[PDB]
């Protein structure tokens, strides 16, 4: 199957704090595997999955110095952004970044990513061609012009097409990660004239899953109530979906559960 690597970075300034807090989180196949936090005792990148303790001390020394550089870069950027948006002192501000690469099932690069957000809203992103920039805000045009003239995109293109792929390849070999947990499903019965039927999906990984209810071949959206997929806290996820049904005719309704770990979609009736 496909693979991916991502780094999610955040700098937050506050009035009572005199320097902003920088946090970087590394992801492989959407699972946290490194983290850095400037608030930490002695700020360093730390392994967040057992398979990363394989890396030697000089790996963590290099990553840590890179994070310290990112921290200074974010700090300067927050200051310039105050000017761009004519914001005064005395407020809280957020600068986020996402970057990384997607690989196909053949381990070839499908697409790179480099996006920034200020105050939680899109600020500037590198286009899929990895040569041009998209920026919506008028204030973000100042940045886009500066970056267009300085060949910043070439620098990021080299990372996304080179190191991001090379190191992801290495990470996948060092953890060859392919694990999926299939959903275990059951339907509960909630006599509310009616009863509510609630289809449960538990113990599944990854989080992506689809629950549907059917009456005589028709999927039922007539108030199919859900909850957002939620983590159990042990690495797996939970979810349920419910329908409003006339009492007595329970066996007319079936629940189906779709998930990439299943040999084929589940089909469930209340028993």
């Amino acid at each position: 199957g496909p693979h991916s690597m991502r780094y999610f970075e955040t700098a937050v300034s506050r009035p009572g704090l005199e320097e902003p807090r920088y946090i970087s989180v590394g992801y492989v196949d959407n699972k946290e595997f490194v983290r850095f936090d400037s608030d930490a005792e002695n700020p360093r990148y730390e392994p967040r999955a057992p398979w990363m303790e394989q890396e030697g001390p000089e790996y963590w020394e290099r990553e840590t110095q890179k994070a310290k550089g990112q921290e200074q870069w974010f700090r300067v950027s927050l200051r310039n952004l105050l000017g761009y948006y004519n914001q005064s002192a005395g407020g809280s501000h957020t600068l986020q970044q996402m970057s990384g690469c997607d690989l196909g099932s053949d381990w070839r690069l499908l697409r790179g990513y480099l996006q920034f957000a200020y105050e939680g809203r899109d600020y500037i992103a590198l286009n899929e061609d990895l040569k041009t920039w998209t920026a919506a805000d008028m204030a973000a045009q100042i940045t886009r012009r500066k970056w267009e003239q300085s060949g910043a995109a070439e620098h990021y293109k080299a990372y996304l097409e080179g190191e991001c792929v090379e190191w992801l390849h290495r990470y996948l070999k060092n953890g060859n990660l392919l694990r999926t947990d299939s959903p275990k499903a059951h339907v509960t019965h909630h006599p509310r004239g009616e009863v509510t039927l609630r289809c449960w999906a538990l113990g599944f990984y990854p989080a992506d899953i689809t629950l549907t209810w059917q009456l005589n071949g028709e999927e039922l959206t007539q108030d199919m109530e859900l909850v957002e997929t939620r983590p159990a806290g042990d690495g797996t996820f939970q979810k349920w979906a419910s329908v409003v049904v006339p009492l007595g005719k329970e066996q007319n309704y079936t629940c189906r559960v779709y998930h990439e770990g299943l040999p084929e979609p589940l089909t469930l009736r209340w028993e």
Binding site: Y7, K66, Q70, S99, Y156, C164
Partner: peptide, 7 residues
């Protein structure tokens, strides 16, 4: 392998 932003 984290990135380093263009200075």
């Amino acid at each position: 392998f984290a990135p380093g932003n263009y200075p």
